[PDB]
Structure formats: structure tokens, C-alpha cells
Design a protein around this ligand. Structure first.
Ligand code: HEM
Ligand SMILES: *[C@@H]1O[C@H](CO)[C@@H](O[C@@H]2O[C@H](CO)[C@@H](O)[C@H](O)[C@H]2NC(C)=O)[C@H](O)[C@H]1NC(C)=O
Ligand SMILES: *[C@@H]1O[C@H](CO)[C@@H](O[C@@H]2O[C@H](CO)[C@@H](O)[C@H](O)[C@H]2NC(C)=O)[C@H](O)[C@H]1NC(C)=O
Ligand SMILES: *[C@@H]1O[C@H](CO)[C@@H](O)[C@H](O)[C@H]1NC(C)=O
Ligand SMILES: *[C@@H]1O[C@H](CO)[C@@H](O)[C@H](O)[C@H]1NC(C)=O
Ligand SMILES: [Ca+2]
Ligand SMILES: [Zn+2]
Length: 595
């Protein structure tokens, strides 16, 4: 009956069995199934897609089509009634730095991107969505509810375009619509190096055989480097300040400029790559460009994997870490390494950890100038504030010394993202990321909240009283029930995010299960997992073991005061130490002596 593999959007299947290095595309990781976890393939389906017409149309598409006998609520109405709040006082996470937020976003961009469709980059269909708020084909606009303030100042809707799907660019009736993952499923620094050979070659410094990445030849972080500019026009980063006219950066990932701390994180990974490569070269003068690009790329991939699994995941998953991600037992070629469709929503727990302001700090970690603290919404697609307002060092001090927002059932997403989000082509700081998330859940054919509770062996509330006990919140349960009518219909993003956090974690039981399963799979299903025998030497792993975000800052900035534990909330100078006391990455176990 069922086939195995639709697809024209394959590049070239050209696997070197003897290769010590990853492909850029993620092909050839699994020997038995070589396209497994490759980029530009369908997101994995842990559960069958749920569409209004069983094939492709989202729930909420046809006004007269219920879900389980109830109209699905407007995404923007759920956002206004449940996700929004006014008072930023007391919202900050008393034991997570802002870098905890920022690393989450970095790891997400390494693992998944479902890009919006393109059957019109030169069309009236392009602007007919924003202009006329007309639903059709890939235009699935987020309509405003009657009492919405934006109805008064912004028109009838927020334009929204359906995510791209695998096989055919326009129509496809082969089976259910499957959304694409444009990046590699492996935790492999694809966001630094790219997931397509072309982008991957557009980015490298070939002009020297030192295996360095291409840099900005127009601005430097006072003796450091900038990501090159995407000189492609029109530029959203130019458009936010036509005076400054500073373009977006060019990274392995097209999202790198979305906000200034993401652009900052990415800058450090371009720079850290050079610091490793040059260290490699001074130690192995005989090695050519490739061995230094490929080998440098392999240590950085290993760095991300370690920071993610050693430092990041244990303070997300808390008491649930050991349950879902037990100590590593080695590579299992039967594990599916593909990112699931649901994971791309689960991992959006990060939107509730984003605070309303970003700060630039000085060597005493004190306000940097008179406009040191800036509203987050002024920093979307903002590269001019890095280049013309003192490079990345002051932002990096903020990442260390400021705190993440804490998820709060009564203060979910800051209005900087819920009302003032900036998106390219669109001209306003007027988008709602929460509403977008809910619309996207439906766009992607997501099973509802109880399908996912069932998937994770958790109770399935069917009444108001049921929902109250699971959320441990009467008022929140009552608002969701008024909007959704049955818990079966709660969109996974808001359902999962609404659950009280697990002991010593930052997500509830459902998300702990979904995130935990996915992370276990991307480690165990990865033939190039840093700690898989034959990837690194027993001695390198003693030394790759040394790596730190604390150390990565010290070694690629002019910052000399850092916490040891950079994801915990750190207050200067009390919880801060001098850089000298921080275990460095001894690359002596990479020393090559052939002759
Ligand atoms: C200021 C910070 C951030 C901004 C401005 C931002 C913005 C966005 C936007 C605009 C989208 C696309 C929404 C859509 O069209 O469906 C998105 C998706 C996403 N965000 Fe965020 N985000 C932020 C922080 C984070 C954090 C901290 C995390 C995780 C810890 C995260 C995880 C995700 C994930 C997984 C997706 C879906 C990616 C995909 O497969 O396409 N984001 N974000
Ligand atoms: C690739 O690397 C070379 C060598 O590291 C870069 O050229 C150096 O950088 C600046 C010019 O921007 C000069 O002051 C140095 O003296 C240059 N050295 C050499 C040996 O050329 C070059 O800019 C990089 N190329 C790109 C496109 O990023
Ligand atoms: C490699 O992973 C596979 C699949 O995740 C494991 O296969 C499981 O085997 C158990 C017990 O033998 C079976 O009951 C299940 O059918 C499989 N797992 C799942 C999730 O359904 C396999 O055991 C793993 N190999 C090793 C050595 O751990
Ligand atoms: C644009 O950038 C310039 C510096 O290049 C700055 O002085 C000015 O305040 C910026 N304007 C806006 C609206 O951001
Ligand atoms: C803060 O988080 C860390 C984990 O990084 C934990 O070990 C520590 O006990 C926490 N501190 C407080 C005060 O709860
Ligand atoms: Ca990747
Ligand atoms: Zn400097």
C-alpha cells in the first residue's frame, strides 16, 4: 500500500564511507538509510498529521468545519486572552542568565527551519495577503478578533504564509502535506557552516589555506571579526534605519540577524572557529586548508554538542533529564535522528523566556552609555547597533549579567514579541509571535494537546475540572475552556507551555517528554556524536571535555570577568571570577607528528 520516500528535492547522493567528517547536507550519517536527518527532507511525523480535510488544509481554514464539533478559536484571540500581560516587574528568572534564553535559540536554529512557501517572489499574491487579508492557497492570514486594538491601527489581519512542503512546489495529492526541515537534524553547527554546499562555499575563507571563514571587509570588533554582510537587497536590517544603512549578516543560517543577541552568538562562533583553526595550524603547520576547515568545523560541532547536553539540557529538563537522556551508550544506527514536526513547536518554549529589554554593559558591568537598556522590539533585524554602538562585547556582558524571563502562567510572552514583532517584507513592528505559533501549529497539521498527553503516557483532561488539576490553575484552565471548548482542541504550543514546570527545570511534563525524546534521538542516532568511539581520541575527549561558554567568551572577547556556570543567574563581581582561573581547551591532543 504505502510507499517509502516521495521527493525530487534531493541534491547528489555521493557518500564517502571512509570520510572522517560530516557532509554539509547531513547525507551519509546513517549508512543503511543515507538521507536520514539530511536537510531539505520532510520533518518526521511521530503521530499522523491532523488537517481539516485529512490531507493539507489547516483546522480554522473553513469557518463551517469544526474540530471535534467546536470552532477552533482565532490564534490572535487566544494570544490576547491568555498569552499577554502588561507588568514586566517580577517576570525575571532568579536562576537563569539571558544566555540560557539565547543558547536555546542557537540550538533550535542548528536543528530545524520550516521556511514559508514561495510560488510568488514576483507576484501580487505577495502583497495581496498583507494588503487584502484574503485567505487562499498559501495565504492563511491571522484575522483580528472584534475587540483587538490592532483592528483600529493595523487593518483586518496579520499576513501569514503557509510553510513549504516536500516533493512539489505547488499542488501535491500523494498523501498528507509534510513540512520541510531546511537544516540538518544533527547538532552539528549547520547554523555556522550552512546545510547547503553553495551557502557553505559562499561563507569560507578559501583565499588562504588556513581553513578560516569569510569575514566583513568593512568593519571589525576592534581587532576581532564581523560576520560578512548579505549585500542582497532589499535588506530588512537596512530598512529599520535607512540612515545607518547597515545590512543583515551572512551566516550558515538565514535567521542570524532576527535579533541582536542571536547575531552576537553567531559572531562568536565565526570567531571561535578561527581561534581553533589558527591554534590547529600553529600546532600542525603541514595541514592544508580543508583539514583546517573540516577539523575546525568538527571541534565547533563538538563544542555545541557538549554545551547543549552537559550544561543546557539538564537545567531545561531538571528532574526529567536522566529519565529521557540517560548517560550515553554509543551510536545506535536504528535510532531515527530526524527532527519531528512537533519538536519544532515544543522547542518554542523559548518564546516565554525572552524578556522585554536588552542591555549593553561596561568592564565594571555597569550601564554602557545613556541608552544602555533598549526595548527588545528595536533590535529585530538590527545590525547597526552592533557595528555603530560598540561591537558585540557590551551585548555579551548583558547575556552574562542579565536574566532570562521566567515562564509564568499569568505572564507568558512579552508584548515586545506578542504585539511589536518585526518580520521581513512587512513594514511594521506589529506582529504577534504567539498568534503566529498557534497559526503555525494548525498550518503543520499538529495533533491537539490530549493526543500529545497520550503520546507521553500522561493524563488526558476532558473537563474544566480535569484541565484545572493538570495546569494547577483554575483561571487559566477556565480561559482555555472558554476558547477551545474541549482540551482535545488545545494547540500543542499553548497546551505544553501552560503546564507547571518540573522540579529544577523550565518546562512542564509534556514538553519534558517531547524535548527529551528528540534530544535522546539526535545524540544516539548521530554516527558523528563527539563521544562515539572513532569520532575523537580518548585524549581529545579529556580535552574537548574542557570546553565552556565561560571559556568561549574569555577566548574570543576582551571580557576578563566571567562566571564559571554561565547559564545560572550571575551577579558581578560576587559570582564572577578572573578568566585565568577557567580551564582552557588544551588542543595538544590534536598535535599531528607523521614525520
Ligand atoms: C528574541 C528572541 C526570539 C525571536 C525574535 C524569535 C522569533 C521567531 C520567529 C519569528 C519564528 C517563526 C515563527 C513562525 O513563522 O512560525 C520563530 C520560530 C522558532 N523559535 Fe523563536 N524567537 C526567539 C527566541 C527563541 C528561543 C529562545 C527559542 C528556543 C529556546 C526559539 C525557538 C524557536 C523555534 C524552534 C522555532 C521554530 C523553528 C522552525 O522549525 O522553523 N526562539 N522564532
Ligand atoms: C581571508 O584571509 C586573509 C588572510 O588571513 C585576509 O587578508 C588579511 O586581512 C587584512 C585585509 O582585510 C590585511 O590587513 C591582512 O594583512 C591580510 N593578510 C593577507 C595575507 O592577505 C582576507 O581578507 C580574508 N578574505 C576574506 C574574503 O574574508
Ligand atoms: C537501538 O534503538 C532501537 C530503536 O529505538 C532499539 O530497538 C528497541 O528494542 C526494544 C527492546 O529490545 C524493542 O522492544 C523496541 O522495539 C525498540 N525500541 C523502540 C523505541 O521501539 C534497540 O534496542 C537499540 N539498540 C540498543 C543496543 O540499545
Ligand atoms: C540610525 O543610526 C544612527 C547611527 O548610524 C543613529 O545615530 C540613529 O539614532 C539611528 N536612528 C534610528 C531611528 O534608529
Ligand atoms: C541555580 O541553578 C544551578 C544549575 O546551573 C543549581 O545547581 C543551583 O542550585 C541553582 N541555585 C539556586 C539558588 O536555586
Ligand atoms: Ca544541524
Ligand atoms: Zn576592543
Amino acid at each position: 500500500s504505502w510507499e517509502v520516500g516521495c521527493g525530487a528535492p534531493v541534491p547528489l547522493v555521493k557518500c564517502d564511507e571512509n570520510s572522517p567528517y560530516r557532509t554539509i547536507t547531513g547525507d551519509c550519517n546513517n549508512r543503511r538509510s543515507p538521507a536520514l536527518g539530511a536537510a531539505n527532507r520532510a520533518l518526521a511525523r511521530w503521530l499522523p498529521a491532523e488537517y481539516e480535510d485529512g490531507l493539507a488544509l489547516p483546522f480554522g481554514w473553513t469557518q463551517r468545519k469544526t474540530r471535534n464539533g467546536f470552532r477552533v478559536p482565532l490564534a490572535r484571540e487566544v494570544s490576547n486572552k491568555i498569552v499577554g500581560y502588561l507588568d514586566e516587574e517580577g517576570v525575571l528568572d532568579q536562576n537563569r542568565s539571558l544566555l540560557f534564553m539565547q543558547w536555546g535559540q542557537i540550538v533550535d536554529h542548528d536543528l530545524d527551519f520550516a521556511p514559508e512557501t514561495e510560488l510568488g517572489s514576483n507576484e501580487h499574491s505577495k502583497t495581496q495577503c498583507e494588503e487584502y487579508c484574503i485567505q487562499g492557497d498559501n495565504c492563511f492570514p491571522i484575522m483580528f478578533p472584534k475587540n483587538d486594538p490592532k483592528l483600529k491601527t493595523q487593518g483586518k489581519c496579520m499576513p501569514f504564509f503557509r510553510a513549504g512542503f516536500v516533493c512539489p512546489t505547488p499542488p501535491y495529492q500523494s498523501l498528507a502535506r509534510e513540512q520541510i526541515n531546511a537544516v540538518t537534524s544533527f547538532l552539528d553547527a549547520s547554523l555556522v557552516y550552512g546545510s547547503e554546499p553553495s551557502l557553505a562555499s559562499r561563507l569560507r575563507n578559501l583565499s588562504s589555506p588556513l581553513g578560516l571563514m569569510a569575514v566583513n571587509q568593512e568593519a571589525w570588533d576592534h581587532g576581532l571579526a564581523y560576520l560578512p554582510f548579505n549585500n542582497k537587497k532589499p535588506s530588512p536590517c537596512e530598512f529599520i534605519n535607512t540612515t545607518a544603512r547597515v545590512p543583515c549578516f551572512l551566516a550558515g543560517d538565514f535567521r542570524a540577524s532576527e535579533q541582536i543577541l542571536l547575531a552576537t552568538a553567531h559572531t562568536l562562533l565565526l570567531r571561535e572557529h578561527n581561534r581553533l583553526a589558527r591554534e590547529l595550524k600553529k600546532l600542525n603547520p603541514h595541514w592544508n586548508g580543508e583539514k583546517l576547515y573540516q577539523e575546525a568545523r568538527k571541534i565547533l560541532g563538538a563544542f555545541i554538542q557538549i554545551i547543549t547536553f552537559r550544561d543546557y539540557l539538564p537545567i531545561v529538563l531538571g528532574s526529567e533529564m536522566q529519565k529521557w537522556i540517560p548517560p550515553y551508550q554509543g551510536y545506535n544506527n536504528s535510532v531515527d535522528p530526524r527532527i519531528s514536526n512537533v519538536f519544532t513547536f515544543a522547542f518554542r518554549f523559548g518564546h516565554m523566556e525572552v524578556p522585554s529589554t536588552v542591555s549593553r554593559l561596561d568592564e565594571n558591568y555597569q550601564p554602557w552609555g545613556p541608552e544602555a537598556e533598549l526595548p527588545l522590539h528595536t533590535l529585530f533585524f538590527n545590525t547597526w547597533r552592533i557595528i555603530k554602538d560598540g561591537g558585540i562585547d557590551p551585548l555579551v556582558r548583558g547575556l552574562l549579567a542579565k536574566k532570562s524571563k521566567l515562564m509564568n502562567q499569568d505572564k507568558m510572552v512579552t508584548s515586545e514579541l506578542r504585539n511589536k514583532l518585526f518580520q521581513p517584507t512587512h513594514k511594521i513592528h506589529g506582529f504577534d509571535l504567539a498568534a503566529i505559533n498557534l497559526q503555525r501549529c494548525r498550518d503543520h497539521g499538529m495533533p491537539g494537546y490530549n493526543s500529545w498527553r497520550g503520546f507521553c503516557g500522561l493524563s488526558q483532561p476532558k473537563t474544566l475540572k480535569g484541565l484545572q488539576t493538570v495546569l494547577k490553575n483554575k483561571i487559566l484552565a477556565k480561559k482555555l475552556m472558554d476558547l477551545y471548548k474541549t482540551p482535545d482542541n488545545i494547540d500543542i504550543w499553548i497546551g505544553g507551555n501552560a503546564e507547571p514546570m518540573v522540579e529544577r527545570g523550565r518546562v512542564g511534563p509534556l514538553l519534558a517528554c517531547l524535548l527529551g525524546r528528540q534530544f535522546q534521538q539526535i545524540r544516539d542516532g548521530d554516527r558523528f556524536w563527539w563521544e562515539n568511539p572513532g569520532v575523537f581520541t580518548e585524549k581529545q575527549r579529556d580535552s574537548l571535555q574542557k570546553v565552556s561558554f565561560s571559556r568561549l567568551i574569555c577566548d574570543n572577547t576582551h571580557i576578563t570577568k566571567v562566571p564559571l556556570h554561565a547559564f545560572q543567574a550571575n551577579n558581578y563581581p560576587h559570582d564572577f571570577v578572573d578568566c585565568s582561573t577557567v580551564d582552557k581547551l588544551d588542543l595538544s591532543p590534536w598535535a599531528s607528528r607523521e614525520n
